[PDB]
Amino acid sequence: VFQDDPYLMPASSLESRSFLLAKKSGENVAKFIINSYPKYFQKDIAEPHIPCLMPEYFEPQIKDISEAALKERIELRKVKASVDMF
C-alpha cells in the first residue's frame, strides 16, 4: 500500500495510519469532484466499456407525482425526500 521511497515509508503505526487516511481523503476528494461535475468525465474512450470508471448519479430524475419517482428515490436512499414524496 505504501511507497518504497525511504522518505515516504511510514516509520510508526500512527504515521502509517495517517498516510493511509490522507490517501483515502485524496481519493474521496477526487470522487467528490467527479460526481459534482460528471460532464467533464462522461467521454468514454476505453473498449470494452468500464462502468466502474464512470461518474455516479445520485439525484432523482423522475419529477412527476407518481409511484415510479418514489421507487427511484427509495433506490437512491433519500429518507427525508422519500417521506415527503409519500
Binding site: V29, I33, Y40, K43
Partner: protein, 56 residues
C-alpha cells in the same frame, strides 16, 4: 475473350458477391463509397481545480 470465360467469370462474381453486371468503372464509385465508413472542455476542468484549491 471467349464467352465461356465471360459467363464463368460472372458466375464467380455471383458466388463471391461481386457485382455480376459489369457497370464500367465510373458508376462503380458508389460501391467504394458505401463499402467504407476537445481542448475547450479540458480547460474549465483546469479552472475548476483552481477554484477547489488543487491547481497551481
Amino acid at each position: 475473350l471467349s464467352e465461356y470465360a465471360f459467363r464463368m467469370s460472372r458466375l464467380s462474381a455471383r458466388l463471391f458477391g461481386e457485382v455480376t453486371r459489369p457497370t464500367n468503372s465510373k458508376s462503380m464509385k458508389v460501391v467504394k463509397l458505401f463499402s467504407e465508413l476537445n481542448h475547450h472542455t479540458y480547460a474549465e476542468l483546469m479552472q475548476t481545480l483552481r477554484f477547489l484549491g488543487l491547481y497551481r
